[PDB]
Design a protein around this ligand. Structure first.
Ligand SMILES: Nc1nc2c(ncn2[C@@H]2O[C@H](COP(=O)(O)OP(=O)(O)OP(=O)(O)O)[C@@H](O)[C@H]2O)c(=O)[nH]1
Ligand SMILES: [Mg+2]
Lengths: 177, 103, 79, 140
């Protein structure tokens, strides 16, 4: 009935905002780096009560030594990468997956994609074209998820809440099963 | 010693031993190792005793957790989840929650 | 209380973190100290706190202490 | 009572709690600001600068405790405090490291001394000065 879910990812990707929106259905625009945040949520999965232990982790490079404090006894990993930043797309495979394997070799990973609403927005797409970069697409996400071994890759936006519940619905199922 | 003295005094004063004396004496002379005799006297009641005992598998093991588990679960903390401070704490088995552990 | 202290309290409230929850014991004392320092870093760098507000607070505490001590002395004299 | 009456600005107490019982996470209450002050001036200063006690002594602590008591937040301040939680965690684990040029053992000892002082001050203030019913859930 107790689940310890730890959310990791590159800085400025929406992890804290994602968790806040899921837990309280509230969204904010201001960006505030986080060190430690804990959120508790109760959900009904397959008619079985479950307590979700959500652990936010800092994505900044100046907290690597301070990150693994939340890893032990974790049930499911949640790696989040922004859909409008190929930098995080590469950084995922670069650091997050190997670090999780080093500190947790037998834990499921649920790859996630943030900023879905900005995937097709205009201003962001021309701004990204200015740098010769393109938004991440579904085939690339699936390819990376199957390369690293993630059992399920999904989309979600903290603003429109599209595909918000499913993210955590699959993670509880990953541990239960 | 007490039982024998009382029985002897009663017999001397009335000429007959106490009416309930023989059964008490039999019980006393039978119960020198009460557990050893109950392990044989409780055989007919073994089924019911085991049925009653096995029902504690859902309460006792979860109530004997170490301090580390309690700290992890943040047991007995009102401020752990402020959004649910008005929610009345409840469980399907309320009496078992506060049932004595030594019992 | 309604003057300099009020303005300083109002100014300090804005820079305070919007939300701050006590971390769990799993992180440990060093991580908790680092988190508290980072959250309250802006307050530490503030300089006028230790020269005006503190001074004003000292002024309001000495006044009340003098009031308390004067009363005790008066009571002793009366006795 | 007069000093308490002088406190009328809403900033002292802040808005009503969202959960309808009390503030826990939000720092809209003066007690959190006092806790931040305690945290900042509890840091061991260098050898070429004065400490809080040398310049202000106990007047600052007395004023802060009086304000907190008159605002009726002594229990909330005791329960909610960064220094107290840090000291409790340090006692539970017992670790000492130089975290950002700040010794841990000395800082927690100073916190211990300051809370000892604050408890006495608050007790004295309370000794000189001396409900809300909630509804149960309804079936749907
Ligand atoms: N428009 C829009 N903005 C979003 C969305 N998700 C997140 N953001 C914004 O993206 C910014 C960064 O997201 P955060 O979650 O705050 O960053 P973080 O994941 O906490 O990063 P670290 O604190 O460094 O670990 C914030 O300004 C969010 O409001 C989304 O779906 N749509
Ligand atoms: Mg964050």
């Amino acid at each position: 009935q107790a689940i310890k879910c730890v959310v990791v990812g590159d800085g400025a990707v929406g992890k804290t905002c994602l968790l806040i929106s899921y837990t309280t259905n509230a969204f904010s625009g201001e960006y505030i780096p986080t060190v430690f945040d804990n959120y508790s949520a109760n959900v009904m999965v397959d008619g079985k009560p479950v307590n979700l232990g959500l652990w936010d982790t800092a994505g900044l490079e100046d907290y690597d030594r301070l990150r693994p404090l939340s890893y032990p006894q974790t049930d499911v990993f949640l790696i989040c990468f922004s859909l409008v930043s190929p930098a995080s797309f590469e950084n995922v495979r670069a650091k997050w997956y190997p670090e999780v394997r080093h500190h947790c070799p037998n834990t499921p990973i649920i790859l996630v994609g943030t900023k879905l609403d900005l995937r097709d927005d205009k201003d962001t797409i021309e701004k990204l074209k200015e740098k010769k970069l393109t938004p991440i697409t579904y085939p690339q996400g699936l390819a990376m998820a199957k390369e690293i071994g993630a059992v399920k890759y999904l989309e979600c936006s903290a603003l429109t809440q599209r595909g918000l519940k499913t993210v955590f619905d699959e993670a509880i199922r990953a541990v239960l099963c | 010693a007490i039982i024998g003295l009382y029985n002897y005094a009663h017999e001397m004063t009335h000429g007959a031993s106490d009416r309930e004396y023989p059964r008490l004496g039999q019980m006393i002379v039978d119960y020198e190792n009460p557990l050893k005799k109950m392990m044989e006297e409780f055989v007919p009641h073994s089924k019911s005793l085991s049925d009653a005992l096995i029902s504690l598998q859902m309460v006792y093991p979860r109530r004997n957790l170490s301090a580390d588990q309690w700290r992890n679960a943040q047991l007995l903390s009102l401020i752990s989840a402020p959004s649910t401070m008005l929610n009345p704490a409840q469980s399907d088995t309320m009496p078992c929650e506060y049932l004595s552990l030594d019992a | 209380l309604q003057g300099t202290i009020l303005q300083y309290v109002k100014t300090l409230m804005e820079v305070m973190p919007k939300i701050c929850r006590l971390p769990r014991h799993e992180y440990g004392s060093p991580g908790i100290l680092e988190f508290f320092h980072h959250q309250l870093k802006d307050i530490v760098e503030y300089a006028e706190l230790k020269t005006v507000c503190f001074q004003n607070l000292r002024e309001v505490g000495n006044a009340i202490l003098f009031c308390l001590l004067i009363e005790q002395s008066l009571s002793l004299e009366e006795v | 009572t007069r000093i308490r009456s002088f406190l009328d600005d809403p900033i002292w107490r802040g808005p009503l709690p969202s959960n309808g019982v009390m503030h826990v996470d939000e720092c809209v209450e003066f007690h959190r600001l006092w806790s931040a002050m305690q945290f900042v001036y509890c840091i061991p200063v260098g050898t070429h600068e004065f400490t809080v006690e040398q310049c202000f002594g106990d007047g600052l602590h007395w004023a802060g405790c009086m304000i907190i008591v008159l605002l009726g937040q002594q229990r909330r301040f005791a329960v909610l405090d960064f220094c107290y939680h840090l000291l409790k965690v340090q006692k539970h684990d017992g670790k000492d490291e130089i975290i950002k040029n700040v010794p841990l053992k000395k800082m927690v000892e100073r916190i211990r001394k300051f809370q000892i002082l604050n408890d006495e001050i608050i007790t004295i203030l309370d000794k000189y000065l001396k409900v809300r019913c909630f509804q149960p859930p309804i079936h749907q």
